[PDB]
Paper text:
For example, Asn-184 (A) means that the residue Asn-184 originates from chain/monomer A. Each monomer consists of three domains: a large domain (residues 1-108 and 212-370) that binds [name]-CoA in an extended conformation, a small domain (residues 109-211), comprised of a non-classical Rossmann nucleotide-binding domain that interacts with NADP+/NADPH, and finally a C-terminal flap domain (residues 371-423) that comprises the last 53 residues of the monomer.
The crystal structures of the apo and the ligand bound enzymes were solved to 2.25 Å and 2.27 Å respectively. The resulting structures follow the overall architecture of the previously published bacterial homologs. Though otherwise a classic Class II HMGR, its entire N-terminal domain (residues 1-65) undergoes a complete domain swap around the hinge region (residues 42-45) and interacts with the main domain of its dimer partner and in doing so resembles the Class I homologs. All the three efHMGR structures reported here suggest that Gln-57, Ser-59 (in the ENQIS loop) and Glu-60 (residue X) make several interactions, which stabilizes this crossover.
Numbering used by the authors:
A (entry chain A): 11 to 370
B (entry chain B): 13 to 372
Amino acid sequence: NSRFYQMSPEERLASLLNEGQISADTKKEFENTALSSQIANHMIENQISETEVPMGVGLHLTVDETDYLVPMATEEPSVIAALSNGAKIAQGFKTVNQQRLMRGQIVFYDVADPESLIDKLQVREAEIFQQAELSYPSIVKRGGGLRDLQYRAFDESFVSVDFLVDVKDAMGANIVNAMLEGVAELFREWFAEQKILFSILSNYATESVVTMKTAIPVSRLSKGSNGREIAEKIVLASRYASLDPYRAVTHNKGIMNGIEAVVLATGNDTRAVSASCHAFAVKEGRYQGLTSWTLDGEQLIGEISVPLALATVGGATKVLPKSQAAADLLAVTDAKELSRVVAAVGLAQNLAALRALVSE
Amino acid sequence: RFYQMSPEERLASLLNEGQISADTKKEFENTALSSQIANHMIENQISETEVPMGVGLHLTVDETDYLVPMATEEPSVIAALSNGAKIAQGFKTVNQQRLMRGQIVFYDVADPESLIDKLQVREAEIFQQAELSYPSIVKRGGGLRDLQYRAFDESFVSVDFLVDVKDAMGANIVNAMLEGVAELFREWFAEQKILFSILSNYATESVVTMKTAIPVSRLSKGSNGREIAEKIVLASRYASLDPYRAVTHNKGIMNGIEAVVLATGNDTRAVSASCHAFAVKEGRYQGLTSWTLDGEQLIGEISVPLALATVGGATKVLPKSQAAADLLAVTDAKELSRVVAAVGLAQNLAALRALVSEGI
Ligand SMILES: [Ca+2]
Ligand SMILES: [Ca+2]
Ligand SMILES: [Ca+2]
Ligand SMILES: [Ca+2]
Ligand SMILES: [Ca+2]
């Protein structure tokens, strides 16, 4: 409690055993680790062991005519089998649209004249962009950096300056934070009368949304001759999810079984993706499903749209050897392609869940 | 054939086919979870993901001290939880419920309110069938407790099941009853059609409310502890106005909650989906905590649906889950949910205190 944060992992475990907080078999199991103790102990604080999540391979996924082998880390049975089944039925997925910009905000408070403050800033945008480069030049040399500023006001007392930043293949926490912390020091020289509450990245990556679709002949749905009937019930089930939040949450949870499994296997931040995806499910003031299914002629059409600010470098994507091994199997080129594969996984998982759900 | 292969044949096939390098194969083979367990929990298993697990410190809930196992790949999370709990000193339970939710959904219903009327006069037979489908839970003092009915779109009827599943998450119990009762509905109403009968992950009857009261002097090592308290109340209030902050505000909460959920072998997707959906109040995605200033004491409160488990799923089959359970030493799932919700509030306190102290 006092020296635990300075203790070595071996001293921590011995301390817990000696104080009776763990048994001898518990200590032996905590010591049964495959991630290097020097890596683990430097990644987090008070480190003592690791959690092991089985990792399997999702099969038959094809996105934009390209085959993939999807690494999926999950503790839940049938998740990988369902992804492989839905992907085989869909045959292929196609990209509809995609953007990739990370969001940040500098928030003012006790603003007497909100509309006038944003007008002061809108004319000096060229100098805000220049201060952004100075606060983080590396990303600008890599070909990214601030791409757009936006302005919003709330409760007649808050003013949010939004930053849309190209963070390239990283998630962008350090880029955006440092960039906005420097641009905030400039905001304070310009307007000493105004006050800043905080300057931080936003995980609601509405400018990293990917939209994927699939078009399935109803014949492919069932090996029998009931495919059209199964398609109609899939459309109804998907429609019902956007009517009843108690189904929407389960509907989207099923999607995240696949999405989070790839996110985890590749060393990405699972809380960030879950937060942004579930928040994005809130449309028209209501929590709805993240996918849509419609019947057009003899073809079942599915579509998904999710904010996926994923990373192929930084964070835990490289420091953890298993992240790199998973990336070798997946063989994506950049983060944009990762988001496309992950979105297609979500839609494939949704197809398998719905088909199994309504086939009675 | 990949599905039928052993884990070793799979890795050999991936290398021989040119999909992974020899270095990657060797890293996939560096595993600590027994191959027999991993290969039986999931499909197409090849390896595992290792997430560093540490110990959150200084957490006190209802005058009981805990050592919190936390599995995360993000630095500073475990340290921030320990610090937030240290400042908090203690956490008190406000209210708690623990019932799991299921639903049988009819479609193409000519008169939803008329079908509901016919159902409400057969509840004794439904309850009787629910027990016959899964008698074990009834003997251990649980089982179906309530039935509710909702109509949607003038064509759907949802029969809602509220079930006491004791220390399990409850998928097998709930789905067993729903299947049995659904077959009864098909005999009773041959003209009606059932779309699906499945567990719902939106556990609104498993919500836990936790609170804390901190003298403002504890927020700062200096003398502006009441200032930092005022700015924490502003940052929290702002989350209830701007969704781009509410997602980040709640993401920070889940850094703690998901870390414990993962360490204890619980379903991370289920908790994430239910918590983020529960954040939608008044048609707006808002924060899951509230912070207010009452004199010289900062008051924090959290309210989250936590249908967590101490048995079933992966809470025991994964040896690290049992080890984590030993460290935390919780008697039942209800207690687990109280501890995890307190972890969420402490993590939020540490994040908000740091967010505003930077702006000063
Ligand atoms: Ca602009
Ligand atoms: Ca490869
Ligand atoms: Ca590529
Ligand atoms: Ca009635
Ligand atoms: Ca113990």
